[PDB]
Amino acid sequence: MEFLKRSFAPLTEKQWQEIDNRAREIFKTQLYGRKFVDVEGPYGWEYAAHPLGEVEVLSDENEVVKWGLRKSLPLIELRATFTLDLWELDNLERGKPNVDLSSLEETVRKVAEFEDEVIFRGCEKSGVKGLLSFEERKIECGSTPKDLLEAIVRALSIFSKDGIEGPYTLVINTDRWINFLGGEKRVEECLRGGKIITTPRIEDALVVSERGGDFKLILGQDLSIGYEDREKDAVRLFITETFTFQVVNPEALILLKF
Amino acid sequence: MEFLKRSFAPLTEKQWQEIDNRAREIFKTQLYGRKFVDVEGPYGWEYAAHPLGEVEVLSDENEVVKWGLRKSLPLIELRATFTLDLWELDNLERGKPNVDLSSLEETVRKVAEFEDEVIFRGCEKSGVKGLLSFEERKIECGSTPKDLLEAIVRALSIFSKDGIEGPYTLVINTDRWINFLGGEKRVEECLRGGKIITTPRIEDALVVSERGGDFKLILGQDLSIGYEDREKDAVRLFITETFTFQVVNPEALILLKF
Amino acid sequence: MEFLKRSFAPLTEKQWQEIDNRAREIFKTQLYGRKFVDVEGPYGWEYAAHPLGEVEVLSDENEVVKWGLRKSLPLIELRATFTLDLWELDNLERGKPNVDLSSLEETVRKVAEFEDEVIFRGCEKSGVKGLLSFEERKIECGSTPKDLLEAIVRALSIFSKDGIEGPYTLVINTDRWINFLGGEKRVEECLRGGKIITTPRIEDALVVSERGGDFKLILGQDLSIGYEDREKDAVRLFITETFTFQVVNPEALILLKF
Ligand SMILES: Cc1cc2nc3c(=O)[nH]c(=O)nc-3n(C[C@H](O)[C@H](O)[C@H](O)CO)c2cc1C
Ligand SMILES: Cc1cc2nc3c(=O)[nH]c(=O)nc-3n(C[C@H](O)[C@H](O)[C@H](O)CO)c2cc1C
Ligand SMILES: Cc1cc2nc3c(=O)[nH]c(=O)nc-3n(C[C@H](O)[C@H](O)[C@H](O)CO)c2cc1C
Incomplete structure (x- = not known):
C-alpha cells in the first residue's frame, strides 16, 4: 500500500500497469507450490509471528511458581531490486507496444525460485521443515x-x-x-x-x-512492487514479500x- | 468503394455476384496466415504508414536544439490484373450454371501466395521481418x-x-x-x-x-475486385489490397x- | 499531457504559471511563419507520418502480381533543455514580482529560430521543401x-x-x-x-x-514545457514539439x- 512509495516514482499509470501485468504473468506460471498448497489469507505488513500452540518450560522442578515461553514461527521478509531505463519506458507513450523488461523478468524468476526452494527444502535458520x-x-x-x-x-x-x-x-x-x-x-x-x-x-x-488443510502457506504481505530511488538514467524498483510455511x-x- | 470503378463495367448484378462468390471461396481456404494471426481492422484507402513508437536522433552532440525523426512501417499496395470473356459471361443470363472462371481462379491463387510469402519470409525493401x-x-x-x-x-x-x-x-x-x-x-x-x-x-x-496480440496484420483496404478497361471481346479486372505485418x-x- | 512529468517537479502552481506565461509571450511574437501559414490541428503525441497520396512501384515489368510502397512525410521531434535556480524561483512566494528567467528566454528564442528555419529553407534529411x-x-x-x-x-x-x-x-x-x-x-x-x-x-x-489551403504546418504536439531531473541547486526543464510542413x-x- 502506502509503504510502497509508488506515487513518488516518475512513471505514469500506463507504465505502472505495463510493469504489473508482466510481473503477474510470469509469477502465475513460475510459482509451483501454490498450485497445490493452501494459502492462508494476508494478515498485513505488521504481522510478525505465527503461533505453534505450545509452551516450553524453563523453571526448575521445586519452584512454587512455574513458567515458560510460548512458541511461534517468525515470518520471512524478502526484497530484491532491479533497474529500468527511462527513455525505453517513455517510448510506450509514443506508442511502442513491446518495451524491454528483461531485468524485471530475470528478477521475478529468481524470486519465484527462492520461494519454491523454501517450500520444498525448508530453511534451518527460520525453523521451516520442507516437503x-x-x-x-x-x-x-x-x-x-x-x-x-x-x-x-x-x-x-x-x-x-x-x-x-x-x-x-x-x-x-x-x-x-x-x-x-x-x-x-x-x-x-x-x-x-x-x-x-x-x-x-x-x-x-x-x-x-488435496482434501484441504494439510499444507499451509501463511502470507503477511503478498508479492508487491515498489520504488526505491532514481539514478541518473534509470529507476530502481524492488519486489517484496513476507511469508512462512508449515506441514x-x-x-x-x-x-x-x- | 467508389475508387473501384465497378459501375462502369458492362456487367449485371448477377455476374458481379458470381465473380465475387468464386473469389471469396478460394481466398477463404488459400489464405493460411490469417488462420492464426490477428487482424487489425481496416483503416481505409488513404492510410499510408503504421507508427513504431520510436525516434531516431540526427543532430550533433553539442547542438542546443536536438531533433530526430519518428519511425514507421510503410504499407504495401498490390494490384493484379486478369481478363474475362463477355460471351461466356453472358451465358449466365441464358441460364448456364457453370461459367468458366479459370483466369480469376489462377490470379486469386497467385495473390494469396504473395501475401503468405510476405507473412512467412518478410520483405527487405519494406522493413517487414517474417516468422x-x-x-x-x-x-x-x-x-x-x-x-x-x-x-x-x-x-x-x-x-x-x-x-x-x-x-x-x-x-x-x-x-x-x-x-x-x-x-x-x-x-x-x-x-x-x-x-x-x-x-x-x-x-x-x-x-x-493464440492468446492474442503477438502477431499483427495491419490492413488499410481488404482484398477487392475492380474494373480497368475493356478490350474488344473481354473485360480487364483487377484485384487490389494494401497491408503490412509485424511480430x-x-x-x-x-x-x-x- | 502526462508524458510531460510536470507533477514530479518541485514547483508550485504559481511558479508553473509564471514560467508558462513568459514562454507564451515570447513565442507569440517570435514565431513568424505562423503569422501567414495554415495550421492543421494537433493529432497527438503518437502521430508519426503524414500521407502524400502516392505509390512508388518496385516490381519488375513481367511480374503477375505488381506492388509498391505508399509515400509519406515523417514528423520531426525536437527537444531543448535549460536549467532554473530554485532559490531565485522561491523568491516569488516571498513576493518578488520580477524573477530572473533569462535561460528560459534564450532557449525559447533558439527554438523559434529553428522552426522558422525549417519553414523558410526546408530540411533535406526530412524531405521538406522550403518557401x-x-x-x-x-x-x-x-x-x-x-x-x-x-x-x-x-x-x-x-x-x-x-x-x-x-x-x-x-x-x-x-x-x-x-x-x-x-x-x-x-x-x-x-x-x-x-x-x-x-x-x-x-x-x-x-x-x-491568404485565401487558405496553400501552405500547411502539420502539428502532432504543440510546443510544451516538461521536467527532466534535478541537480543539486536547480531544475532541468525542456521544451518539446513535433511537426512537419508542406507547400x-x-x-x-x-x-x-x-
Ligand atoms: C529528441 C529526443 C528525445 C528524447 N526523449 C527522451 C525521453 O522521452 N525520455 C528520456 O528519458 N530521455 C529522452 N531524451 C534524452 C534526454 O534528454 C536525456 O535524459 C539527456 O541525457 C538529458 O540531458 C531525448 C533526447 C532527444 C534528443
Ligand atoms: C446468336 C448470337 C448470339 C450472340 N450472343 C452474344 C452475347 O450474348 N454476348 C456477346 O458478347 N456476344 C454475342 N454474340 C457475338 C457478338 O455479336 C460479337 O461481339 C460479334 O463479334 C460482334 O460483331 C452473339 C452472336 C450470335 C450470332
Ligand atoms: C534564510 C535562508 C533562506 C533560504 N531560503 C531558501 C529557499 O527559499 N529556497 C532554496 O532553495 N534555498 C534556500 N536557502 C538555502 C538552502 O538552505 C540551500 O539549498 C542550502 O545549500 C541547503 O543546505 C535559504 C538559506 C537561508 C539561510
Whole structure:
C-alpha cells in the first residue's frame, strides 16, 4: 500500500500497469507450490509471528511458581531490486507496444525460485521443515510405466489405511515424465481423475492429497512492487514479500523414489 | 468503394455476384496466415504508414536544439490484373450454371501466395521481418511420432518459463504430417486440445500461442475486385489490397527443426 | 499531457504559471511563419507520418502480381533543455514580482529560430521543401518606392493569370523596409488593404495569398514545457514539439529579387 512509495516514482499509470501485468504473468506460471498448497489469507505488513500452540518450560522442578515461553514461527521478509531505463519506458507513450523488461523478468524468476526452494527444502535458520524432509513417507518405484502405475496403486492403499480420502495429485520431474509419456490417460485413471503437475524443482515424484488443510502457506504481505530511488538514467524498483510455511498433517504426503 | 470503378463495367448484378462468390471461396481456404494471426481492422484507402513508437536522433552532440525523426512501417499496395470473356459471361443470363472462371481462379491463387510469402519470409525493401527469421527460437526434433510428442512437451516447457499461457497451435508441412499420421489424437492431447494446421508454405513445423496480440496484420483496404478497361471481346479486372505485418512478441513462437 | 512529468517537479502552481506565461509571450511574437501559414490541428503525441497520396512501384515489368510502397512525410521531434535556480524561483512566494528567467528566454528564442528555419529553407534529411526553394516564382525589383509599387502590381497580374484571388500579404526584411519607409499607405492601397509583415528571417521580399489551403504546418504536439531531473541547486526543464510542413500550391507565392 502506502509503504510502497509508488506515487513518488516518475512513471505514469500506463507504465505502472505495463510493469504489473508482466510481473503477474510470469509469477502465475513460475510459482509451483501454490498450485497445490493452501494459502492462508494476508494478515498485513505488521504481522510478525505465527503461533505453534505450545509452551516450553524453563523453571526448575521445586519452584512454587512455574513458567515458560510460548512458541511461534517468525515470518520471512524478502526484497530484491532491479533497474529500468527511462527513455525505453517513455517510448510506450509514443506508442511502442513491446518495451524491454528483461531485468524485471530475470528478477521475478529468481524470486519465484527462492520461494519454491523454501517450500520444498525448508530453511534451518527460520525453523521451516520442507516437503522432502519427511523421509519416513517413502516408497520405491521402478522406471517403467507399469512400475509407475503399481506405485500409484500402492500409495492409494497407504492413504486408505491412514484415513486420508480426497482428490489425489502427482507432482513429477519433467525429464522423468518424458520417459513415461504415452500413459497419461492410464495414470489419470489410476489417480481417479486427478491432476499431474510437472516441475523442475524436484528430481523424483510425490503424491499428495488435496482434501484441504494439510499444507499451509501463511502470507503477511503478498508479492508487491515498489520504488526505491532514481539514478541518473534509470529507476530502481524492488519486489517484496513476507511469508512462512508449515506441514500440518504429514500423513497426506508420500515420496516416490526412482 | 467508389475508387473501384465497378459501375462502369458492362456487367449485371448477377455476374458481379458470381465473380465475387468464386473469389471469396478460394481466398477463404488459400489464405493460411490469417488462420492464426490477428487482424487489425481496416483503416481505409488513404492510410499510408503504421507508427513504431520510436525516434531516431540526427543532430550533433553539442547542438542546443536536438531533433530526430519518428519511425514507421510503410504499407504495401498490390494490384493484379486478369481478363474475362463477355460471351461466356453472358451465358449466365441464358441460364448456364457453370461459367468458366479459370483466369480469376489462377490470379486469386497467385495473390494469396504473395501475401503468405510476405507473412512467412518478410520483405527487405519494406522493413517487414517474417516468422521464420527469428532463429533463436529454435529446437531440434526427430522423425518419429514419439519425437514429435517429446518436442511439443519441451516447447510447452519453454512457453511456461517465458510466461506465455494460452491455447497452442501446431503449424506443419503436409508431407511431414503424412508420415506422422496415426497419432493425431495423442498430439491433440499433448497440445491440450489445440489445433493442427497443415500447409505447403513451410518445410518444417512451428508452435504458436493464440492468446492474442503477438502477431499483427495491419490492413488499410481488404482484398477487392475492380474494373480497368475493356478490350474488344473481354473485360480487364483487377484485384487490389494494401497491408503490412509485424511480430510484436517473439516469445510466443518456437521453431521445430526436423 | 502526462508524458510531460510536470507533477514530479518541485514547483508550485504559481511558479508553473509564471514560467508558462513568459514562454507564451515570447513565442507569440517570435514565431513568424505562423503569422501567414495554415495550421492543421494537433493529432497527438503518437502521430508519426503524414500521407502524400502516392505509390512508388518496385516490381519488375513481367511480374503477375505488381506492388509498391505508399509515400509519406515523417514528423520531426525536437527537444531543448535549460536549467532554473530554485532559490531565485522561491523568491516569488516571498513576493518578488520580477524573477530572473533569462535561460528560459534564450532557449525559447533558439527554438523559434529553428522552426522558422525549417519553414523558410526546408530540411533535406526530412524531405521538406522550403518557401525560398521555388525559384521559378521569381520577379525582379528595383530599390525605390516606385519600383516596389510597380513590382507589387506585376505580382497581382501574375496571380490573376493563375486564378489566385484572395487577400494579399507582403513579407519583407526590416532593413529593406526602413529604406521604403514613407510609402506605407500607398503600398497598402496597391495591395488592396493587405498586410505587411517585417521579419529578419529573409533578405528580400515575397508576396503571398491568404485565401487558405496553400501552405500547411502539420502539428502532432504543440510546443510544451516538461521536467527532466534535478541537480543539486536547480531544475532541468525542456521544451518539446513535433511537426512537419508542406507547400501544396506553389502558384500562390511570388519571390521578389532586389
Ligand atoms: C529528441 C529526443 C528525445 C528524447 N526523449 C527522451 C525521453 O522521452 N525520455 C528520456 O528519458 N530521455 C529522452 N531524451 C534524452 C534526454 O534528454 C536525456 O535524459 C539527456 O541525457 C538529458 O540531458 C531525448 C533526447 C532527444 C534528443
Ligand atoms: C446468336 C448470337 C448470339 C450472340 N450472343 C452474344 C452475347 O450474348 N454476348 C456477346 O458478347 N456476344 C454475342 N454474340 C457475338 C457478338 O455479336 C460479337 O461481339 C460479334 O463479334 C460482334 O460483331 C452473339 C452472336 C450470335 C450470332
Ligand atoms: C534564510 C535562508 C533562506 C533560504 N531560503 C531558501 C529557499 O527559499 N529556497 C532554496 O532553495 N534555498 C534556500 N536557502 C538555502 C538552502 O538552505 C540551500 O539549498 C542550502 O545549500 C541547503 O543546505 C535559504 C538559506 C537561508 C539561510
